[model samples]
Target: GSALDFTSCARMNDGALGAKVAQAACISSCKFQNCGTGHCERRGGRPTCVCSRCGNGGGEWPNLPSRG
Candidate 1:
């Protein structure tokens, strides 16, 4: 699988904006294709895209959601 692409969020001067961009990126990335629209939570303040539950898809970026 390809790595998470944050290029769409590069050079964000605002933390909130950056987090939002990151969330949008995760939700829009190909990794999330064919996945569910899980919620975006903050793990120590970073955006976490948890599309699949444990033992659900068996790996990272599984069954991700669409960006909107």
Candidate 2:
């Protein structure tokens, strides 16, 4: 079987009132801010989403835990 590169699969939920708690939880949780890719969730104070390309796409896009 072919393996999937879940590197760029990370993302966060879009919310208003200054970044949703989940988004805040992502970036504020670890050294992800300085990862190879700038995968930090940016609320920008907007209630809509433009893109969720914060870090490697493994954790944010799925917005859930991986079984692997």
Candidate 3:
């Protein structure tokens, strides 16, 4: 099985507000992927999602749909 890749889904922003938003986005995004839980962290200055557990599907991570 392949690992879930959220490279495209990562949020890139500056400042604390952006970090907070990115954290929220990561939590929800990971949950939608069936990862149960996740956290946001800076990877080379970009906010990335770190999933606590891999999804059951174990495939490429899909791009998140636009929010209303």
Candidate 4:
């Protein structure tokens, strides 16, 4: 399993609104990809979606919704 980054779906920010949106988007994206769970965190100075328990087919990214 590997982490899938959904940075495009939502951007993580200091504000609550941005964080909530990023978290929701990450979760939704992870669910759609059949991952166990999703979270947002800073990586390389940028916000990224960290998906866990994605199994063997985790690295490949999928089509994301316009909004989560």
Residue pairs in candidate 4 whose N, alpha carbon or C atoms collide under 3 angstroms? none
Tens digits of per-residue lDDT, candidate 2, 1-68, equal 56532122122333353345433444344344433323333345432222333454433544666677
Model 3 lDDT per residue over 1-68, tens place: 57544543354354677566667777787888888776775667665677666667443345855556
Which rank order by TM-score, best down to worst? 4, 3, 1, 2
The sequence of per-residue lDDT tens digits that candidate 1 reaches over residues 1-68 is: 57554343331334877767655665565244555444355455454555443334633543786656
Superposed by TM-score, candidate 3 places the C-alpha of residue 67 at a distance from the truth, in angstroms, of 40
Candidate 2 residue 54 C-alpha distance from true site, Å? 9.8
lDDT (CA) for every model shown?
0.50, 0.37, 0.63, 0.71
Kindly report the root-mean-square deviation of model 3 from the true structure over all alpha carbons.
13.1
Off by over 4 Å in 3: 1-13, 44-46, 55-68
**TM-score, structure 4 vs. true:** 0.63
Which one wins on TM-score? 4
Q: Which parts of model 2 have CA positions greater than 4 angstroms off?
A: 1-19, 32-68
lDDT of 1: 0.50
Among these predicted structures, which one has the highest lDDT?
4
Q: Least lDDT summed over 10 consecutive residues: which range in candidate 3?
A: 3-12
